[PDB]
Amino acid sequence: PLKPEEHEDILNKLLDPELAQSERTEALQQLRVNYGSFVSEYNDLTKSHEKLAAEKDDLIVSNSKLFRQIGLTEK
Amino acid sequence: PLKPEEHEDILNKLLDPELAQSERTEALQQLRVNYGSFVSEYNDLTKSHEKLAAEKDDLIVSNSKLFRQIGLTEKQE
């Protein structure tokens, strides 16, 4: 999304009560779109992270089960 | 962290040029604090995600060997 500095530039621009209403509505739009994407990209990462966590769990549990089983057969 | 609706509420308040300066200043501060807090949570999530992806890759390597090991033996059986 927007780099923190780029976000900062918009906030400083919106601080001026004298900014043309056109630019005000525009800048405010950038913030709206940006946040939209950001929350989207975040929700997805969260889901992608939960899937990996679940897979890692299955992998580690069977890594242990497999290790143990092999030691009963010989080792 | 701000819910999209809570954030939109702030953006709407900021649209009005007649808003008192103290209000405008305060709202913008809220957006800054919220954005910095959002970027941090995102950066942290990205790191643990990368760590998880790496661990998963290593566990697959490991399980690949254990499964094949279990296989050769039951094939010698």
Residue B48's region, left for phi above 0, alpha for psi from -120 to 50, else beta, is: alpha
Q: Which residues contact A37 (CB under 8 A, 6 or more apart)?
A: A1
Resolution of this model in Å is: 2.2
Dihedral, CA atoms, B77, A70, A55, B64, nearest 10 degrees? -60
Separation CA A63–CA A71 (nearest Å): 13
Q: Which residues contact B1 (CB under 8 A, 6 or more apart)?
A: B34, B37, B38, B41
Counting one residue from chain A and one from chain B, the pairs whose CB atoms sit within 8 A come to: 84
Q: Chain A partners of B39 at a C-beta cutoff of 8 Å? A: 4
Task: List residues of chain A with CB under 8 Å from any CB of chain B.
Answer: 4, 7-8, 11, 14-15, 17, 21, 24-25, 28, 31-32, 35-36, 38-39, 41-42, 45-46, 48-49, 52-53, 55-56, 59-60, 62-63, 66-67, 69-70, 73-74
Cβ <8 Å between A67 and B63: no
State both tokens at B3: 């819910």
End-to-end CA distance of chain A: 54
CATH of region B1-77? 1.20.5.400
From the candidates B18, B22, B56, which should be mutated to test the interface with A, based on the most A CB atoms within 10 A? B56
Least Cα separation, residue A1 to chain B (angstroms): 9
State the helix-helix crossing angle for B4-15 and B21-76, rounded to 10 degrees.
Answer: 160
Q: What are the φ and ψ backbone dihedral angles of B13, each rounded to 5 degrees?
A: -65, -40
CATH of region A1-75? 1.20.5.400
For residue B27, the tally of other CB atoms under 10 A from its CB is 20
> Cβ distance B73 to A75 under 8 Å?
no
